[PDB]
Each structure stands twice: as C-alpha cells, then as structure tokens.
C-alpha cells in the first residue's frame, strides 16, 4: 500500500545520481572536431527474389553471406558479392519478423507470430537445410533472436520477456523479465556476455547473460522502441523509436548522450546500426529511406533513399565494407 | 566465370525459378483475416475438409487460408501491419449481444478501428452477422432500442436486423475504396462458405482489374 512512496523517493535518488554525473553536454565536447562531411553511398548491389515484404536480414560473420526473411514464407541466403542465392529455406509460418545467422555460419534461426524460434542447420550431409530445432516457450511473438554460439541463442518476444535457450536440449536456460511492454529489439555485446533490449514501454534494458538479471534501465523516449544496436566498443548503444528519434545511451554514465532528430522528420525508426568505427549511425525510417548520422555531432551526414517502401531492416558488415538495407518493396540493397 | 562459379549461378537460377513457381501457387490462395470482438469464432467450423491459427480449406477449386489471431494478446498495432494485403477480413458479429453487456457497441468500436485502418484502406470486409436466431427471440422479448436509443422501428427481425446492418455499414468512411459484404450467418451446410467464396471472387476480380490497368 504505502510502499509505493519509498519507490518514488528511490526514483528521485536514482535521477539525482545520473544528474550528478552530467556535466559535459557531449555536443559541447565536440565543438573543435572536424565534421564527417558529406557521405554519398551508391547501391552497389540489388538482391531480388522475395515476393513479399521482407522483415529482417542478418549478415554472416564472413561479411559475404547474408540471410533475409520475408512474408512469402522464405528465408533466403544471399552471396552478396555475386547476388547468388546459396539457399532458399521454406518456412512453416510465413509470419516471420526476425532472422539470425550463427557466428559459425552453420545455422540460421527465424521466428514470428508463431511464437517459435526455428533453428535451421545449413551444413548437413544430405545437402539440404533441415530445421534442427523449434524453440517453444514464448507466449507472445518472436521479434528478435540472436545467436551466441552454435548451441546458445537469445530471443525476445511480445510477451514482454526475453529468453536464453540451450539448443541440444531446447529448454529456456534463462528468462529475462522486467519489461512492461512488448520487447521489439535485441543486441548482443561484442563479448556476448551482456545484451540490451528495447521494448514498447519506451525503455531499454541492459541485462546479464550469466546472472539472468537486469543490470540497467534506460528511459528518454516518448514512444515505443523498435530498433537497438550496440556501439562497437560495447560501452554504449543506440535506440530508435516511433517518435522519429534515435538516442545514444552510455552504459557507464547510465544516461543518454545524443538525440538524433530533425524537425522535418516525423516517421519512426525501424532499424538501427553502427559503422565499424562507430562514427556513423545508420537509421532506417518509415519515410521509405535511410539516414546516416554523425554519431558524435548529431548532424546528418547522408541519405540512402533508394527504396520504394518502408525500410524494415538494416545492417553493416563486420569488416565494415558494405551496408545492407531491406524494405517492404521486397528488395535488398547493398550500399557502399 | 570459373567452373564452380557457374554451377553456383545455375543453382541460383534454379532457386529463383522455384521461388517464382512457389509465389505463383501462393497468389492463387485467398488469405482471410478472421476478426471479431470477444470471438462467431469456433463460423470457422463451417467447412470440415501458438499465436496465429491458420485454418486451410477448399471450395470450388479455390484455396482458403483463414488466419485467426485471437490468441495474440499483444497490442494489435505491432502485428496488424503483417496482414496488410490479405484478400479480405471476415468480421463476425453476434446479433444476440445488443441487450447483453454494450457488447454490440464494442463490436461497432472494433469494426470502426479495423475498417478505418491505415493498413486496410482497400481490404474488403465480410461482415458476418450471426446469432440471428437468438436475436429473433431477444428482440421479441426485449426491444432493440436497449442498445440503439435512436432506433424507432418495429422490434422485428426484418427491420431490426436491417437497421443493425446499416448501423454497421455506415462506419465505413471510405466507400469508394473498399466494400463491406454483409451477410446474416445461417449454417445451411455450404451457405456461409458460399457467401465467402462469392465475396472473395468479387474482390479478386476487382484486384485483377486494378492489376491489369483495366480499372
């Protein structure tokens, strides 16, 4: 009953803490740094073959193979260098909202409104892609699955939870609860030891894989969050919401640093990614195009307007040589 | 170029051909989104050939996939855009709910939310007004004005049912774009499926006229 009072006080205290360690105004710290300039990117490749809206894509760690899922009930593996289709995996549920590629490259995973993360084995005798597992246990919908290794995957779902599974067994080895809304995005740290999620409660959470408990909470958005990425250093992350704004949060200061918005932008961000140096923040929008931001200056540095519909997914390669954007017009584009 | 690089190209071309052939077979199936406040769910039993529940049946060489999303407890705004492009929306409303509770007003509110939706601008709605049998007895005993104060007509099926049908069809704010195919559900073996097939073929014909430029 009255216990709600203490929490309020505690909340104030927390604010004061992150209010006491705020004396920089990062934008004011970069007054003397040279700007990135102007970034013009060309559609190096166009990957065709999906017959419906594509909803997710993921790069292979080799920076050459990528997987994309679409509503045509297809998970296509593309060789980005030659535009060749390596595999075309037919799915049992065409309502696919996410797709992942194992760091080893042996497996791809996918899921959506079916509430299951199906895991498909690519490197098999028999020369076919068989589904190696179907991880059930979520009561919402899969919005993002991201591999840790060949035998460990971390999912997020519309039931306001995330999970960490074991493949050989198929059981949830950990469950991450604490969101008061659908969890819509996931991002694993470069050390794959702690990940971050962003939910529809307009908040992000920094979790711990081993312990299983939330470590930090991150507010500041005035609408739901759809995209989240980690900065390459693994000490900050970027989130993209429906309020037309991208924000950068630092895990050590427990406070946001930059807000990437413009008055002439009213749509919501669907996907977020960083560059190999973390110096360019790429954000896909509902206005049918993508925007490139100077992550340290907050000023836009370019645009990738080449999609005739909503850009839904977006990802940069590990070597940093290319960018891939997927959209609701059923085409993927490799920029550079 | 290389021997093995050209075998990869041939494999990719075969994959493309199979994708084309599988997309051709999917475009001849008629996807139907099954809605309805508080569930005529369980309307779905008509033909007797985990989030979404896809029910597959066949009628007159036409394949119907009816996707039910009753189990999805998440906010509709985050997964309703997935069904943008379905052939039609089957919206079942129980006539014998005007007296209960208000429930008819909830049905009307849901119909307004769905029909006037950014994603369903051109998606025709098949309005199934079921429970007409119980509606007869209800209006015989309890006047239909319980739910519609403005109602000023005889408490009889012939008039009350029509008044409710017009009160539902008036919620459409885009009558130039979409059409609502109203129907009073009656088991009659293959009577509801027949109406669904008729409305679906009309919608398909409209879409094919639009896709050919002939309209």
């Amino acid at each position, epitope marked *: 009953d009255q216990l709600r009072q203490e929490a309020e006080q505690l909340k104030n205290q927390i604010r004061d803490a992150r209010k006491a360690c705020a004396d920089a105004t990062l934008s004011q710290i970069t007054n003397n740094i040279d700007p990135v300039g102007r970034i013009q990117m060309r559609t190096r490749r166009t990957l065709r073959g999906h017959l419906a809206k594509i909803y997710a894509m993921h790069w292979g760690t080799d920076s050459r193979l990528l997987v994309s899922a679409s509503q045509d009930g297809k998970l296509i593996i593309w060789d980005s260098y030659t535009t060749n289709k390596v595999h075309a995996i037919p799915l049992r549920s065409s309502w696919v909202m996410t797709c992942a590629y194992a760091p080893s490259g042996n497996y791809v995973a996918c899921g959506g409104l079916d509430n299951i993360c199906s895991i498909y084995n690519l490197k098999t005798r028999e020369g076919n892609v068989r589904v190696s597992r179907e991880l059930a246990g979520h009561t919402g919908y899969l919005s993002c699955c991201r591999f840790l290794d060949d035998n460990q995957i971390v999912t997020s779902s519309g039931d306001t939870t995330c999970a960490l599974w074991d493949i050989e067994t198929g059981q949830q080895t950990t469950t991450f609860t604490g969101h008061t809304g659908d969890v819509m995005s996931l991002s694993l740290a470069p050390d794959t030891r702690l990940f971050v999620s962003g939910a529809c409660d307009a908040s992000a959470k920094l979790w711990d894989v081993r312990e299983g408990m939330c470590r930090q909470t991150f507010t500041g958005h005035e609408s739901d969050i759809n995209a989240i990425c980690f900065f390459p250093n693994g000490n900050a992350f970027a989130t993209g919401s429906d309020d037309a704004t991208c924000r950068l949060f630092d895990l050590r200061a427990d406070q946001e640093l930059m807000t990437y918005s413009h008055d002439n932008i009213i749509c919501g961000i669907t996907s977020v990614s960083f560059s190999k140096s973390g110096r360019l923040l790429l954000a896909g929008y509902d206005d049918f195009n993508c925007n490139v931001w100077d992550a340290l200056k907050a000023d836009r540095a370019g645009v990738l307007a080449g999609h005739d519909n909503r850009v839904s997914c977006l990802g940069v390669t590990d070597d940093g040589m290319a960018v891939a954007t997927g959209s609701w017009d059923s085409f993927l584009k490799i920029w550079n | 170029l290389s*021997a*093995e690089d050209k075998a990869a190209v041939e*494999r990719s071309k075969m994959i493309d051909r199979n994708l084309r052939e599988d997309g051709e077979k999917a475009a001849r199936e008629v996807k139907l989104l099954l809605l309805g406040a508080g569930e005529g769910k369980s309307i779905v039993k008509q033909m007797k050939i985990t989030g979404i529940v896809e029910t597959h049946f066949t009628f007159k060489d036409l394949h119907f996939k009816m996707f039910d999303v009753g189990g999805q407890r998440s906010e509709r705004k985050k997964w309703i855009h997935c069904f943008e492009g379905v052939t039609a929306i089957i919206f079942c409303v129980a006539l014998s709910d005007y007296d209960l509770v208000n429930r008819m007003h909830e049905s009307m509110k849901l119909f307004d939310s769905i029909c006037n939706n950014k994603w369903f601008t051109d998606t025709s709605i098949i309005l199934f007004l079921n429970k007409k049998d119980l509606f007869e007895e209800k209006i015989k005993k309890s006047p239909l004005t319980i739910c519609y104060p403005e109602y000023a007509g005889s408490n009889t099926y012939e008039e009350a049912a029509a008044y409710i049908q017009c009160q539902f069809e008036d919620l459409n704010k885009r009558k130039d774009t979409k059409e609502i195919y109203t129907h009073f559900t009656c088991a009659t073996d293959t009577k509801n499926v027949q109406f669904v097939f008729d409305a679906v073929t009309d919608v398909i014909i409209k879409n094919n006229l639009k896709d050919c430029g002939l309209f």
Partner: single-chain antibody
Amino acid sequence: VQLVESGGGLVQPGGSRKLSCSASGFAFSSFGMHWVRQAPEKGLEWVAYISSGSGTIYYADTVKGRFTISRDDPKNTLFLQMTSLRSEDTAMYYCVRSIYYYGSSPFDFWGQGTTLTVSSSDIVMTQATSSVPVTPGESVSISCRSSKSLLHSNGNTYLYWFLQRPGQSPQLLIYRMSNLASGVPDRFSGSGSGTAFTLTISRLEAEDVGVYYCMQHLEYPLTFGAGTKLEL
C-alpha cells in the same frame, strides 16, 4: 549417404552397355553428378558430368558422341549409356556427388563403382612421385604440379586432393587446396599457389596408406594426377 552402382560386367568390343547409380540418403536432385573411371592399375579420369536439374552436361574428349549421361531425379538414379565400347573402356566406374554454392565441398562422396571389362588445351597435373616409403609418426608432404595456374581471379585455387586406400574408393581430403573436408582429421593440410601444390600429413598412421590423387576443378575437362602411392 549411399551411392550404389550396377551394370558392370563383360561385354564384347563395339557393344553397348548401361551403368546405373542408385542414390539413397541425400537430396539427389540438388547434387551435380560425375562419372569417374579408373583403369585396372592406372589412375582416375573424369568421364562425364550432369548438373542439378540436368541443364548442363559435360563429357571427356575420349567419350564424346558414344557416352550419354542421364539422370532420373524422381527415382534418384544416374545413368551412363555406352556405345561402341573399346578395350580402353575397361575400368571401374565411380559415381560421384557434387554440389556447387559458395563454400560447398564438391566431390565429397564417391560410390563403390562397377567393373567393366572387354576382350581385345586440357590442364595437365603432374604428380611425379609414384612411391614413398614411410613409417608411422613421420611427416610426409605429397607434391602436385599443374601446367596452368589454378588460381582464379576470384581468389579461389581450384585444387582437390583425394585418397584411395587399397580395395576402396577415393575419399576427398582437401578442396580448393586449403579447405579440409568433413570427416578427415587436422593431420591433413594443403598449401601452394599457381601450379605448385603440396599436401602435408602430421603424425602419419595406419589407414593413411593408399594412393593420393590430385585434381583441378578450374575448368572442364577435369584432370587428375597420376597418383602418389604411399606405402611402408
């Protein structure tokens, strides 16, 4: 997987004969198939190739016109029809798998083969050694040389290494001169460039004694080395 072969036998010169290959345990339709041949006491020679979907067929210059390679995908079968047979056609014929996509491993599985007997610009791969005495635990390096650089402009060096133990069928060890096949230990390795190719074995052991073969997949026809025997 299984690739059984039937039809072999004894025929008179100039006759005709059909060889059948039954596949079981893999997606036959998504696999390119080759017909390799091995004379009684000689090396391997690639005979024919039919792509997945049958949209591409290749023949050796020695069999063009009189050998036809067919493929019955629904029943998972491969056929070789031979007409106007000669004494040079007496050999054991092997059915071989091959899938081609980025990172695949062609020639990963061979059949047991059928024996046929009868009464009485191409790249050249030089495998000079024909015998090498060894003792278990010793490290040996088998050498191969080609008449033309196998390195393609795409960065791939299309060199393949096979091993054929006595009374057995060849078993892929290395594909593209560096990549190690699945089912072979880290003892085997390969390295080189542009017509200079070397295999390497560390901590040799029994069951490694056989004939190591070289092959190029840069372009058709596919050519083999003469085979480097390795005994004790």
